[PDB]
Design a protein around this motif. Structure first.
Motif, PDB file in Angstrom:
ATOM      1  N   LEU A 338       0.820  -1.217   0.000  1.00 36.23           N
ATOM      2  CA  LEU A 338       0.000   0.000   0.000  1.00 36.23           C
ATOM      3  C   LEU A 338       0.862   1.279   0.000  1.00 36.23           C
ATOM      4  O   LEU A 338       0.701   2.140  -0.867  1.00 36.23           O
ATOM      5  N   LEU A 339       1.769   1.391   0.964  1.00 36.11           N
ATOM      6  CA  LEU A 339       2.634   2.575   1.088  1.00 36.11           C
ATOM      7  C   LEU A 339       3.493   2.838  -0.156  1.00 36.11           C
ATOM      8  O   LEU A 339       3.697   3.994  -0.535  1.00 36.11           O
ATOM      9  N   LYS A 340       3.974   1.763  -0.783  1.00 33.97           N
ATOM     10  CA  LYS A 340       4.804   1.832  -1.979  1.00 33.97           C
ATOM     11  C   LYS A 340       3.990   1.952  -3.265  1.00 33.97           C
ATOM     12  O   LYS A 340       4.568   1.997  -4.348  1.00 33.97           O
ATOM     13  N   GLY A 341       2.658   1.996  -3.156  1.00 37.34           N
ATOM     14  CA  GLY A 341       1.771   2.048  -4.336  1.00 37.34           C
ATOM     15  C   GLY A 341       1.896   0.840  -5.262  1.00 37.34           C
ATOM     16  O   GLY A 341       1.665   0.936  -6.471  1.00 37.34           O
ATOM     17  N   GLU A 342       2.268  -0.299  -4.689  1.00 32.56           N
ATOM     18  CA  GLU A 342       2.516  -1.518  -5.450  1.00 32.56           C
ATOM     19  C   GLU A 342       1.279  -2.423  -5.529  1.00 32.56           C
ATOM     20  O   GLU A 342       0.178  -2.036  -5.135  1.00 32.56           O
ATOM     21  N   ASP A 343       1.476  -3.622  -6.069  1.00 29.25           N
ATOM     22  CA  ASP A 343       0.415  -4.595  -6.277  1.00 29.25           C
ATOM     23  C   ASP A 343       0.434  -5.578  -5.126  1.00 29.25           C
ATOM     24  O   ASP A 343       1.495  -5.876  -4.581  1.00 29.25           O
ATOM     25  N   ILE A 344      -0.748  -6.081  -4.771  1.00 23.21           N
ATOM     26  CA  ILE A 344      -0.873  -7.265  -3.922  1.00 23.21           C
ATOM     27  C   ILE A 344      -1.248  -8.442  -4.841  1.00 23.21           C
ATOM     28  O   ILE A 344      -2.084  -8.297  -5.742  1.00 23.21           O
ATOM     29  N   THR A 345      -0.599  -9.587  -4.643  1.00 22.90           N
ATOM     30  CA  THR A 345      -0.958 -10.804  -5.389  1.00 22.90           C
ATOM     31  C   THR A 345      -1.858 -11.722  -4.549  1.00 22.90           C
ATOM     32  O   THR A 345      -1.560 -12.035  -3.393  1.00 22.90           O
ATOM     33  N   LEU A 346      -2.963 -12.137  -5.157  1.00 22.78           N
ATOM     34  CA  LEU A 346      -3.944 -12.979  -4.513  1.00 22.78           C
ATOM     35  C   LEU A 346      -3.685 -14.432  -4.895  1.00 22.78           C
ATOM     36  O   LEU A 346      -3.417 -14.719  -6.060  1.00 22.78           O
ATOM     37  N   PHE A 347      -3.737 -15.324  -3.901  1.00 21.50           N
ATOM     38  CA  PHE A 347      -3.518 -16.760  -4.074  1.00 21.50           C
ATOM     39  C   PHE A 347      -4.612 -17.536  -3.331  1.00 21.50           C
ATOM     40  O   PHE A 347      -5.086 -17.099  -2.271  1.00 21.50           O
ATOM     41  N   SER A 348      -4.996 -18.686  -3.886  1.00 20.65           N
ATOM     42  CA  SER A 348      -5.680 -19.708  -3.121  1.00 20.65           C
ATOM     43  C   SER A 348      -4.674 -20.381  -2.184  1.00 20.65           C
ATOM     44  O   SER A 348      -3.585 -20.755  -2.628  1.00 20.65           O
ATOM     45  N   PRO A 349      -5.024 -20.539  -0.881  1.00 20.34           N
ATOM     46  CA  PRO A 349      -4.148 -21.223   0.088  1.00 20.34           C
ATOM     47  C   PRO A 349      -3.748 -22.658  -0.293  1.00 20.34           C
ATOM     48  O   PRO A 349      -2.745 -23.175   0.223  1.00 20.34           O
ATOM     49  N   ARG A 368       9.612 -14.477   1.784  1.00 18.59           N
ATOM     50  CA  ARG A 368      10.381 -15.347   0.887  1.00 18.59           C
ATOM     51  C   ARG A 368       9.485 -16.227   0.025  1.00 18.59           C
ATOM     52  O   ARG A 368       9.662 -16.290  -1.192  1.00 18.59           O
ATOM     53  N   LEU A 369       8.532 -16.905   0.672  1.00 11.23           N
ATOM     54  CA  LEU A 369       7.515 -17.697  -0.022  1.00 11.23           C
ATOM     55  C   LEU A 369       6.623 -16.858  -0.924  1.00 11.23           C
ATOM     56  O   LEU A 369       6.291 -17.275  -2.033  1.00 11.23           O
ATOM     57  N   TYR A 370       6.251 -15.668  -0.462  1.00 16.42           N
ATOM     58  CA  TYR A 370       5.302 -14.821  -1.177  1.00 16.42           C
ATOM     59  C   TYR A 370       5.899 -14.266  -2.469  1.00 16.42           C
ATOM     60  O   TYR A 370       5.240 -14.259  -3.509  1.00 16.42           O
ATOM     61  N   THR A 371       7.133 -13.777  -2.400  1.00 14.47           N
ATOM     62  CA  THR A 371       7.782 -13.192  -3.585  1.00 14.47           C
ATOM     63  C   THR A 371       8.161 -14.277  -4.588  1.00 14.47           C
ATOM     64  O   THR A 371       8.041 -14.080  -5.798  1.00 14.47           O
ATOM     65  N   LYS A 372       8.610 -15.414  -4.063  1.00 18.55           N
ATOM     66  CA  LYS A 372       8.832 -16.617  -4.855  1.00 18.55           C
ATOM     67  C   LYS A 372       7.585 -16.939  -5.680  1.00 18.55           C
ATOM     68  O   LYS A 372       7.624 -16.858  -6.909  1.00 18.55           O
ATOM     69  N   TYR A 373       6.473 -17.252  -5.007  1.00 18.57           N
ATOM     70  CA  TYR A 373       5.218 -17.635  -5.677  1.00 18.57           C
ATOM     71  C   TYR A 373       4.655 -16.573  -6.617  1.00 18.57           C
ATOM     72  O   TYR A 373       4.020 -16.918  -7.616  1.00 18.57           O
ATOM     73  N   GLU A 374       4.895 -15.295  -6.302  1.00 21.20           N
ATOM     74  CA  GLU A 374       4.528 -14.185  -7.197  1.00 21.20           C
ATOM     75  C   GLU A 374       5.258 -14.281  -8.547  1.00 21.20           C
ATOM     76  O   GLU A 374       4.736 -13.829  -9.570  1.00 21.20           O
ATOM     77  N   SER A 378       3.641 -20.672 -13.031  1.00 22.57           N
ATOM     78  CA  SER A 378       2.857 -21.895 -12.985  1.00 22.57           C
ATOM     79  C   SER A 378       1.742 -21.853 -11.909  1.00 22.57           C
ATOM     80  O   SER A 378       0.762 -22.594 -12.010  1.00 22.57           O
ATOM     81  N   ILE A 379       1.906 -20.993 -10.893  1.00 18.63           N
ATOM     82  CA  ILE A 379       0.922 -20.809  -9.805  1.00 18.63           C
ATOM     83  C   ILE A 379      -0.282 -19.952 -10.245  1.00 18.63           C
ATOM     84  O   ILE A 379      -0.099 -18.848 -10.772  1.00 18.63           O
ATOM     85  N   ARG A 380      -1.507 -20.442 -10.020  1.00 20.38           N
ATOM     86  CA  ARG A 380      -2.692 -19.589 -10.220  1.00 20.38           C
ATOM     87  C   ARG A 380      -2.658 -18.376  -9.253  1.00 20.38           C
ATOM     88  O   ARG A 380      -2.362 -18.518  -8.062  1.00 20.38           O
ATOM     89  N   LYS A 381      -2.937 -17.192  -9.792  1.00 21.80           N
ATOM     90  CA  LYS A 381      -2.779 -15.956  -9.047  1.00 21.80           C
ATOM     91  C   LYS A 381      -3.542 -14.822  -9.706  1.00 21.80           C
ATOM     92  O   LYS A 381      -3.923 -14.914 -10.879  1.00 21.80           O
ATOM     93  N   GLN A 382      -3.750 -13.748  -8.943  1.00 21.79           N
ATOM     94  CA  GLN A 382      -4.271 -12.513  -9.501  1.00 21.79           C
ATOM     95  C   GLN A 382      -3.625 -11.290  -8.839  1.00 21.79           C
ATOM     96  O   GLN A 382      -3.388 -11.286  -7.633  1.00 21.79           O
ATOM     97  N   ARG A 383      -3.354 -10.257  -9.637  1.00 18.85           N
ATOM     98  CA  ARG A 383      -2.771  -9.002  -9.146  1.00 18.85           C
ATOM     99  C   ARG A 383      -3.858  -7.960  -8.995  1.00 18.85           C
ATOM    100  O   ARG A 383      -4.710  -7.810  -9.870  1.00 18.85           O
ATOM    101  N   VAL A 384      -3.819  -7.239  -7.884  1.00 20.67           N
ATOM    102  CA  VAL A 384      -4.680  -6.083  -7.686  1.00 20.67           C
ATOM    103  C   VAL A 384      -3.842  -4.957  -7.098  1.00 20.67           C
ATOM    104  O   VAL A 384      -2.856  -5.211  -6.399  1.00 20.67           O
ATOM    105  N   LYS A 385      -4.218  -3.719  -7.407  1.00 27.10           N
ATOM    106  CA  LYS A 385      -3.611  -2.548  -6.767  1.00 27.10           C
ATOM    107  C   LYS A 385      -3.880  -2.575  -5.252  1.00 27.10           C
ATOM    108  O   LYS A 385      -5.029  -2.719  -4.839  1.00 27.10           O
ATOM    109  N   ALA A 386      -2.822  -2.447  -4.448  1.00 27.24           N
ATOM    110  CA  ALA A 386      -2.953  -2.399  -2.990  1.00 27.24           C
ATOM    111  C   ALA A 386      -3.892  -1.276  -2.549  1.00 27.24           C
ATOM    112  O   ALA A 386      -4.698  -1.470  -1.630  1.00 27.24           O
ATOM    113  N   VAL A 387      -3.798  -0.124  -3.223  1.00 32.46           N
ATOM    114  CA  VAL A 387      -4.686   1.016  -2.971  1.00 32.46           C
ATOM    115  C   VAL A 387      -6.146   0.610  -3.151  1.00 32.46           C
ATOM    116  O   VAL A 387      -6.991   0.935  -2.305  1.00 32.46           O
ATOM    117  N   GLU A 388      -6.433  -0.091  -4.248  1.00 30.26           N
ATOM    118  CA  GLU A 388      -7.802  -0.457  -4.608  1.00 30.26           C
ATOM    119  C   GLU A 388      -8.371  -1.499  -3.651  1.00 30.26           C
ATOM    120  O   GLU A 388      -9.520  -1.385  -3.211  1.00 30.26           O
TER     121      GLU A 388
END
Lengths: 728, 16, 578, 16, 146
Positions: A338-349, A368-374, A378-388
């Protein structure tokens, strides 16, 4: 002439002198009350043939209708009239019977548990009767008496009969909880606990107040259940909810492990959430009134945007689950995006090995796990704006007041529990409870863990000084610890949590009043050092009482899973930024306590949690929990009329109080919450508040919503409960 | 209602 | 409205003292020259100094060529097309003269009877009769229609002014009075059933309802058991609740306690029962159904009104002279005014009924330091209303000695030496202990011997216009506020309560009353002495109640309180909005 | 609006 | 609607040729015995072979105790309250016998005249007179006003 229908069928001429004398009795010591006004207003409503109990209700209500901030003592006039009436209803006279005689009678009618007559001799009841002061009933306010009569006092809910009075409730709650104590100390604990509760120093929850002394063993009001990602666990969770809501418990449900819609739970979280809701509402009037739950999930959950809008009024019924509340779980990394105006990546657990676990237990592993999987396409994922994403969450929080926040890193870096072993991964209904859990495979799975917590509070307005907490802490810890062995457990996994960890949640009431009488406020930082001092004393003395109880009775079976076991204290792990907003020193010997805990352990893995109160605060005429009052006079609807309660010592303190909407903003209050959280084992039901009329064009800006959220995080606030928006 | 306007630059200052 | 003027051109032709002297001159015109100008002067002084108030038709018209002064008519409809038609015709005639109407239509047989089609279409026809001379068939023209609570159609009747519903099931521009007796209330208290009957199927029951409660009970329980009689059972709670719900939402479903109207009454109910009231629920007179507009055997009741201004008298013995003046002025008007319907002339000439009330009661209490809500005014009201009735009766008794008792005087309880002090609801003894200060035993013998010129003297009506002329508080009502406000073409019209300067704290404003009890006790006390009835209001402020809702329990308890203290009727229910 | 709740037992006491 | 029957119990009491012969017998009942039965036979043959049709009140009622056979009434209202009232009364009487009404109300003076309040409130009153004997004050009862 004017006649009265006596309590059965007989008739006598009205006794106006007798009425006058009871009013005169009730008015004694009071100021700015007019007996003659009460007489005028009530007597005009009398008619030839009026039932005696109708005369009583009439005069009670006449006094009650005159309660105001200019004449606050009508609160006490009406109360004492109500007490008088209730004595007559229970006993056919004003003087209560001897305690033994009362208990014998109640056991015969099946209203009291006969274990009382087994565990104490007649001689012991005579002794307990010497402790009792029935005149402490004269210290209740009117709204207190209405709470007692509506929910506390043993009564026939069919026929309207009341069977006991408040001092019998208090002495017998004490007698039951301390019943197993050796005769060498037993009656001393009873007397002392009786004195603490009947003089309002300690407050207990409604299930204890209504039930301890009676045949029931249902006293659990607060359950936390974690659901695993399987049909078997979904079913077990649902079953456990149904069982506990039939006993009127509030539920915290962790359902964030359920895999997202579209996964190789192909159909998603929502239909399972809907099923948890009907489980919660299964024992409710018309499937709505009663039954309450808060359900928890991570902010990075693949379905989060759908989850966030579940209580929104508009939309398709299939996309809505409106009659539960929600806690969104967040850690530093989410906020950094949020502070960096970056993206959050959404994952199924289900698609991200170790990430769910790491979210709660280990922030560097999570990163470490989060940036790796981002990066792994091959991992199902979605990007959204942290602000949004944050904006959407805050918009839903603002419009419902009931999208909550849990800072799960704070819940685990500053915690009674080692997160590698016993992580905190959810909270309860009201966002103050933070305990470990394990998913069930079956309602009767002995390897599951459902967390329970037994609650109480210290009344900050009834203590003359902080060292009084030593004795109150001994009393409260011991009473609740005994209740853990006394109460029933309908689910084995809940018995496991309670017997393993022996978790307590002792909080406070009358905090606003306490600040006022010390000349401090919420909004300006004037209360920071006082709060540091106050909450140090609470935690120190709680820890001291539980440590002594451990020496005497044994540490809790799973004591080794606490940070306490490793000689870690709350003063070691608190958010450092707190150093910038208070400089109160520690006044107690925490180093000595540290060694004693290391050596003898604690009877209880947690002691402190700051819960909301309404009912128990009302009994004491206390301000609720840690909250500023909305106004000087609180108002409740009832079948018996409009119930008013004036804040304590309005007469001398009206300018010293800071009313909720007088606060220019949330900062000062959040700093106090942060300071409290330095010492509190669990969490705190912290509110945020916004008055639209303080903002340009009457709209609360998102900027301010997010800045307050960030302020909370920066001062180590673990959770955020209700957002209140003034309408006005 | 609320004002959804968000200054993303003002936020970047904050220190968690 | 008062001063003679050109309503076309805007010209005003007279001033107030000419109106007053000429009203006096006209009313006393037939008096012998020995006393005539003395009565004129005295009546002139009484009205122009506001001691006595008269209705608008008298104030606008007496001195001018008109003879239309009847503003209050009571018509009883029989169960036949001929009587339905005659009733409709008489309404039309009287509303064209701007009279308010009380209509008794409770004898019309129910829907489904061997009036096969029911009451409602006839009620609708009475409404258009009432509205026949109104602007766009709505503005102006006013009526209250009466029926028994046990009428077979009652649940349909109760909801006639409800906004929602089919137009065929609604008759919205009349008000309604539901007629109730002790037995109905007893069913409520006992949680029992009320049985509904068409008046056509139950011989003697309608008559007995008004005239004879023990006969009503005997006939009613009998017919309840006879399974050959068409009937319906309803819960008394549900029926009473429905009535009170409609009263609350419109303010205009009224109550008449018909047993009280007949056990405590100027009239013998075996001969001349009271079976209805008027528009405003203060008038209680006998009637007989017409067969034809010109039926000489019908009786339409009329009543000529006035009031004493309680704030303009220095003491109660002033009422002796005021009573002489008011009774004589109105009695003379009975011979002066026109009668468009023969059956109305019959009522007026036969019974010579008057309805003299009061204004400025709130102000009077205030200057005596009493209030409505707390019982502080009980003995003062007893004392005050004794003096009114005593002196009214005394004036009419003297007028009888001088001019003759009214032709049908023998039909009054007065003729049998019965007085209001003999027949009042006994429960009044529990809420006042003021003694009688006047010699009622001497009056009793004088009435027995010489009779009364007038079968009724007293009724407590609402006022608005006449109160405003005197700057008096209206009737017996507490003011809503210190300043009243009226819209007009000439600007906002304000009126401050009398002696606000010295009395503002002594006044008790309507919404300052904690409840209705004290006011209803005063009404009951007044009713001890009043010949007819009283336009009693009930009032509720939602903000005094939990969740701002007025509970049904309190609505029914006030209704029961009214009954217990012998209250004959209940007019408007006012609900504060706020 | 009004509250249609009626305690039928409370009423039975009353004496007309 | 034609055959004599119990409207309570559903029983029918006659058949069509009895209706027809008896309508004929009643209407020609006062004729001299020299011609009477010849008129009866001839009128019976005309109606039962459908050459002549009669209104419902005649077909349902002539032969029975009723004498109500008027189904069509025309009433002219004058410009006075007395005539307005008489007109209303006559309507009510006739609609209770199920007659249709033609009402001439064109003489009633206009709104604003030195019936200061106009025609319409009197028209409304004629309507409730017409509907006075109708089910729920609507079904049945019919008038045309001129």
């Amino acid at each position: 002439n004017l006649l009265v229908t006596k309590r059965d069928g007989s008739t006598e001429r009205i006794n106006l002198d007798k009425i006058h004398r009871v009013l005169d009795w009730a008015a004694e010591g009071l100021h700015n009350v007019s007996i003659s006004q009460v007489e005028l207003r009530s007597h005009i409503q009398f008619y030839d043939g009026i039932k005696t109990s109708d005369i009583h209700e009439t005069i009670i209500k006449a006094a009650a209708d005159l309660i105001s901030r200019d004449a606050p003592d009508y609160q006490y006039l009406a109360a004492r009239l109500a007490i008088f009436h209730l004595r007559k209803k229970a006993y056919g006279q004003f003087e209560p019977p001897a305690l033994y005689d009362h208990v014998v009678k109640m056991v015969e009618m099946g209203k009291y548990d006969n274990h009382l007559l087994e565990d104490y001799t007649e001689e012991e009841f005579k002794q307990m009767d010497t402790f009792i002061d029935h005149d402490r009933d004269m210290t209740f306010s009117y709204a207190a008496v209405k709470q007692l009569e509506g929910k506390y006092l043993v009564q026939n809910r069919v026929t309207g009969e009341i069977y006991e009075s408040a001092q019998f409730l208090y002495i017998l709650v004490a007698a039951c909880l301390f019943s197993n104590y050796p005769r060498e100390t037993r009656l001393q604990y009873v007397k002392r606990f009786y004195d603490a509760v009947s003089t309002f120093k300690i407050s207990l929850p409604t299930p204890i107040m209504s039930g301890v002394r009676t045949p029931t063993r249902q006293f659990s009001s607060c359950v936390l259940i974690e659901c695993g990602d399987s049909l078997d666990s979904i079913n077990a969770t649902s079953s456990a909810i149904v069982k506990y809501v039939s006993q009127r418990a509030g539920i915290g449900i962790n359902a964030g492990r359920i895999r997202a819609l579209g996964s190789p739970f192909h159909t998603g979280c929502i239909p399972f959430y809907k099923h948890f809701q009907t489980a919660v509402k299964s024992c409710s009037q018309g499937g709505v009134r009663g039954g309450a739950a808060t359900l928890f999930y991570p902010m990075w959950h693949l379905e989060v945007e759908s989850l966030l809008v579940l209580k929104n009024n508009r939309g398709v019924e299939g996309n809505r689950v409106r009659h539960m509340d929600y806690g969104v779980q967040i850690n530093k990394l989410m906020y950094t995006r949020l502070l960096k105006g970056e993206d959050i990546t959404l994952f199924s657990p289900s698609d991200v090995p170790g990430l769910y676990d790491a979210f709660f237990a280990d922030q560097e592993e999570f990163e470490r796990l989060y940036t790796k999987y981002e990066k792994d396409d091959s991992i199902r994922k979605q990007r959204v704006k942290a602000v949004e994403l944050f904006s959407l969450m805050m918009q839903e929080r603002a419009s419902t007041g009931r999208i909550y926040i849990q800072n799960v890193d704070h819940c685990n870096t500053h915690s009674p529990f080692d997160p590698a072993i016993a992580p905190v991964r959810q909270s309860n209904l009201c966002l103050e409870i933070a305990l470990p859990t394990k998913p069930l495979n079956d309602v009767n799975d002995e390897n599951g863990e459902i967390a329970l917590c037994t609650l109480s509070a210290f009344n900050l307005g009834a203590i003359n000084n902080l060292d009084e907490l030593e004795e109150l802490a001994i009393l409260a810890v011991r009473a609740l610890d005994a209740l853990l062995d006394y109460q029933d457990y309908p689910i084995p996994a809940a018995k496991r949590g309670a017997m393993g960890r022996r978790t307590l949640g002792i909080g406070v009431i009358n905090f606003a009043y306490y600040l006022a009488k010390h000349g401090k406020r919420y909004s300006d930082g004037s209360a920071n050092n006082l709060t540091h001092k106050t909450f140090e004393a609470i935690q120190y003395y709680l820890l001291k009482a539980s440590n002594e109880l451990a020496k005497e009775q044994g540490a809790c079976p799973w004591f080794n899973e606490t940070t306490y076991a490793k000689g870690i204290l709350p003063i070691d792990t608190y958010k450092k930024d707190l150093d910038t907003i208070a400089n109160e020193p520690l006044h107690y010997d925490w180093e000595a306590l540290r060694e004693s805990i290391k050596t003898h352990g604690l009877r209880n893995s947690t002691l402190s949690a700051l819960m909301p109160s309404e009912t128990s605060s009302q009994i004491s005429n206390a301000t609720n929990g840690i909250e500023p009052p909305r106004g000087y006079v609180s108002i409740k609807a009832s079948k018996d009329g409009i119930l008013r309660q004036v804040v304590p010592d309005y007469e001398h303190l009206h300018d010293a109080y800071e009313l909720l909407w007088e606060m220019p903003g949330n900062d000062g209050y959040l700093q106090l919450v942060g300071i409290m959280q330095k010492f509190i084992d669990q969490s705190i039901s912290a509110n945020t508040n916004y008055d639209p009329s303080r903002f340009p064009s009457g709209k609360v800006p998102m900027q301010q919503l997010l800045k307050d959220l960030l302020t909370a995080y920066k001062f180590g606030v673990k959770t955020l409960y209700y957002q209140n928006t003034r309408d006005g | 209602q609320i004002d959804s306007e968000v200054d993303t630059d003002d936020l970047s200052n904050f220190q968690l």
